[PDB]
Amino acid sequence: YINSKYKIDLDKIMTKMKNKSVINIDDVDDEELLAILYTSKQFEKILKNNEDSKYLENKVFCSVFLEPSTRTRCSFDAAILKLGSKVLNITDMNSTSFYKGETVEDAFKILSTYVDGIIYRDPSKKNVDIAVSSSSKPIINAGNGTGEHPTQSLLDFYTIHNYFPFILDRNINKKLNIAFVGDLKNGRTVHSLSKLLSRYNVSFNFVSCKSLNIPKDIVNTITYNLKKNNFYSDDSIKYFDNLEEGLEDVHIIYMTRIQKNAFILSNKTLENTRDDTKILHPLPRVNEIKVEVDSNPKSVYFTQAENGLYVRMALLYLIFSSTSHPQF
Amino acid sequence: FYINSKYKIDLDKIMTKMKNKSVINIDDVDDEELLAILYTSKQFEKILKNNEDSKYLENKVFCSVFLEPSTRTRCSFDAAILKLGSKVLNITDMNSTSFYKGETVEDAFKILSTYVDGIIYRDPSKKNVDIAVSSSSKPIINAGNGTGEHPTQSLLDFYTIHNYFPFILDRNINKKLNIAFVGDLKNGRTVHSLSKLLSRYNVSFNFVSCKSLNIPKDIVNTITYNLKKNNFYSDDSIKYFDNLEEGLEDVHIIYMTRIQKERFTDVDEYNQYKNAFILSNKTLENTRDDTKILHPLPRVNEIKVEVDSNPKSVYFTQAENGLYVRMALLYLIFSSTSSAWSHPQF
Amino acid sequence: FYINSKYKIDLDKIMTKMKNKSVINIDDVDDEELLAILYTSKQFEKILKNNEDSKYLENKVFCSVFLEPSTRTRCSFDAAILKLGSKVLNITDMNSTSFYKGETVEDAFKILSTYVDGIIYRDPSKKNVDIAVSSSSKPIINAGNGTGEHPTQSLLDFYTIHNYFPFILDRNINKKLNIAFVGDLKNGRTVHSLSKLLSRYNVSFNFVSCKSLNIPKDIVNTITYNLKKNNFYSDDSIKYFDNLEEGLEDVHIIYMTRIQKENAFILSNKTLENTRDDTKILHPLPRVNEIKVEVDSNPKSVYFTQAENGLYVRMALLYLIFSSTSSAWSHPQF
Ligand SMILES: CC(C)(C)OC(=O)Nc1sc(-c2ccccc2)cc1C(=O)NCCc1ccccc1
Ligand code: NA
Secondary structure, eight states: OBSSSOBOOHHHHHHHHTTOOBOSGGGSOHHHHHHHHHHHHHHHHHHHTTOOOOSSOSOEEEEEESSOOHHHHHHHHHHHHHHTOEEEEEOSOOHHHHSTTOOHHHHHHHHHHHOSEEEEEESOHHHHHHHHHHOSSOEEEEEETTOOOHHHHHHHHHHHHHHOGGGGSOOTTOOEEEEEESOTTTOHHHHHHHHHHTTSSEEEEEEOOSTTOOOHHHHHHHHHHHHHTTOOOTTSEEEESOHHHHTTTOSEEEEOOOOOOTTOBOSGGGTTSOTTOEEEOOSOOSSSBOGGGGGSTTBOHHHHHHHHHHHHHHHHHHHHOOOOOOOO | OEETTTEEOOHHHHHHHHTTOOBOSGGGSOHHHHHHHHHHHHHHHHHHHTTOOOOSOOSOEEEEEESSOOHHHHHHHHHHHHHHTOEEEEEOSOOHHHHSTTOOHHHHHHHHHHHOSEEEEEESOHHHHHHHHHHOSSOEEEEEETTOOOHHHHHHHHHHHHHHOGGGGTOOTTOOEEEEEESOTTTOHHHHHHHHHHTTSSEEEEEEOOGGGOOOHHHHHHHHHHHHHTTOOOTTSEEEESSHHHHTTTOSEEEEOOOOGGGSSSHHHHHHHTTTSOBOSGGGTTSOTTOEEEOOSOOSSSBOGGGGGSTTBOHHHHHHHHHHHHHHHHHHHHOSOOOSSSSOOO | OOBSSSOBOOHHHHHHHHTTOOBOSGGGSOHHHHHHHHHHHHHHHHHHHTTOOOOSSOSOEEEEEESSOOHHHHHHHHHHHHHHTOEEEEEOSOOHHHHSTTOOHHHHHHHHHHHOSEEEEEESOHHHHHHHHHHOSSOEEEEEETTOOOHHHHHHHHHHHHHHOGGGGTOOTTOOEEEEEESOTTTOHHHHHHHHHHTTSSEEEEEEOOSTTOOOHHHHHHHHHHHHHTTOOOTTSEEEESSHHHHTTTOSEEEEOOOOOOOOSOBOSGGGTTSOTTOEEEOOSOOSSSBOGGGGGSTTBOHHHHHHHHHHHHHHHHHHHHOOOOOGGGSOOO
């Protein structure tokens, strides 16, 4: 099992990931990240070539979405169904109507008797952690109020690694430069992907309009990670409030969502970027990216969204399998 | 493969043509495609009535997106997918505005179509379905929109008729089908769609309505051009009546529409129109012996419960037929390939 | 071949009788059918706790119709169908009036039953379930209605009891089970249903309630006629208390009910110290105050196992009604 230059011992990494709960991106170590990246790639190729995808038959999951949150929920459903497993849904409900005079711990202790695993989206942070403590079965966090969204970070990382595979090498001569653009204060997807990218040889351009800057405790978490692998320097973190400077010499531009510009992306504002730059956005997009950019080959935000299917298939396969592997 | 015992269906070739086809309007189905649908529907009807293996399409994952409540069509599409042995994720009980929460229809469909092999979409907006089709990398079946496009209702309507009157397929100048459309012909879009499809054949039409709720001119024009084009138009081709006693005479089919009180000024107008067009065993005594009664449902008072025991009533068979017709259409579009041994064949 | 310790089960014969049966009330289950359910439930419990293949009912497509919020029962029936290897479409987020949008219950059920092999139906109206059964070409499982019929709640309650006290099946005049029902005995319909089923056996009852919320006479009468039928009725058979201290003495089972206060009877480790060693505590759930979280660590608490058992009991009932099967070798036998 190879992804160019690293052999992955998938048997051994699955033994370790079996019945693992995934709440935060920090619950995924280096070895587990390689296994996910590798397996995601196998599912991408199997599905793009119309091959049998049914690597996880015989499982029954529960999907609990207590805010309307249709793309992430459908992505998890499709992944389960394409793997050949089954799922029952709780949707179109909020906290109060689902927990109708019942504790979170009662609800999860009972629900986990019915199913092999639970996928849970709840805008409360407390609820996901209470569910994990109460559940006899593994939980995948599909997004909560603390800004934990592990599968968004994983699919973001998979997407980058697909155009810039050298991010995995921890090579002091091969650095990736990324610009994060928009609302860096409220854009939790930046916070989570930053922590994961900072384990690697990466330098960051934070591009925001003063009022919406990256929070200090993320800058600190980036600086501790980069220091730990001896890739911190005074040039590791740069701050801009304009595109013209922010977007210069970055392999990746990652746009965030807003609501109420310095930061609208046009073919014009992209003429002076590297020819290899790729554009991500977790979606949905509003004005941050003009429709004309969809025809620009630097745009990969729809491939990115597509990649969430393969990454969620991979993560469900590695946690829930009982045991050959997807290959080719 | 034979239909009517006259017309040979090369299902391999017709599948190659229908593969990854979107079905939005009944005019997206040609003569050959309609034969393959009718034939395949009949095989699913017999396999299921005999408790045989129905799993002729197993490895597919669909998304079903219903942005207005419409329980029977949605459940019928679910059942069809599941009976074929495929899988479906559902968006229900939601409207346009809450599902498109500050996202364009084009963004939503471009992404959703990466997840799945095909989409079933019901939206009361007509624009939305056409935008979905333009944005989607995967086929769409329109399960109903605001323009009155509802191709699987028309298809299951036609399947039902063809089961009692198979000669409608022959385009034989000696073998004419006579149908009465009864009730709200202005707002009954199922009449509009079925009319267009029937007018490809040797058919004459009785439009039975009171003044205010008559068939629109643009449908009469489309029926008249279709009948002319196959040299079946005469001054007899389209008649208009305001009462059952005349309207229901010498028709093979009576097709009753919904007369929703919210289409009148008040109750007195409703209950006058109601009552004038209500179907009883009495109002059916001077129809042909062979007359069959359709209604797209749901039923309110348009038809009295006593008529359910009358052998001329088939509106519950009609609704059941939607399962077989939706199984057929899904099989023909989404199969990756054929053998002659992979086809349903009772 | 099919044994339940010392009851031999003729599953072929009992399935011939249960095939395409509708189950609306606990009285639609006779002695033989109850043994088939108990036996099949036990096989599913062991297969699933040992991670074996559970797919004993492939190729069916069900419709599950929930016209009130009723999340646990609905998820339990979904899980059961999916674990058996069959498929389901769901109608939820609906009440009576919005689902029957100017359509009769009989029209809706006549049509829906053409699509599917079976229907699971929860509706707070009692009329609706009985009209559904009259109109349907396919079998219905009642998942709960307004008359307090909830057959799979009673069945999973009974399965739970029989697991700790298997002698309830023997109808042995020397082996009596003592149960206390605690809380709102007037509105607690699962007491009503389980009482009727327990009273087919050698059972005595402690009804513990204030005064305003006492067991209704019609249930006392139905318990007395059942117990008389097997000559287990005596003036000792039914006792009435207004306090836990007396009510809870010498009972093998304590069954706590929901009381939505729309204080006397909260269960604590303290109020449990002088119960039998062997007493088990049920509660149909959800619980609010009736049982303190401290009791969850008490080994007498089984209300979470009880709720888990609903999976195995719903798998069993679906298998026994819907199987297309003939042969003794196809049945689960851990
Ligand atoms: C994290 C991801 C993107 C996977 O989660 C979803 O997609 N769910 C969500 S949270 C959301 C939102 C918007 C405003 C305020 C608060 C939350 C957008 C949405 C969302 O789904 N599209 C909004 C409208 C829409 C729904 C589905 C498809 C297309 C458009
Ligand atoms: Na599903």
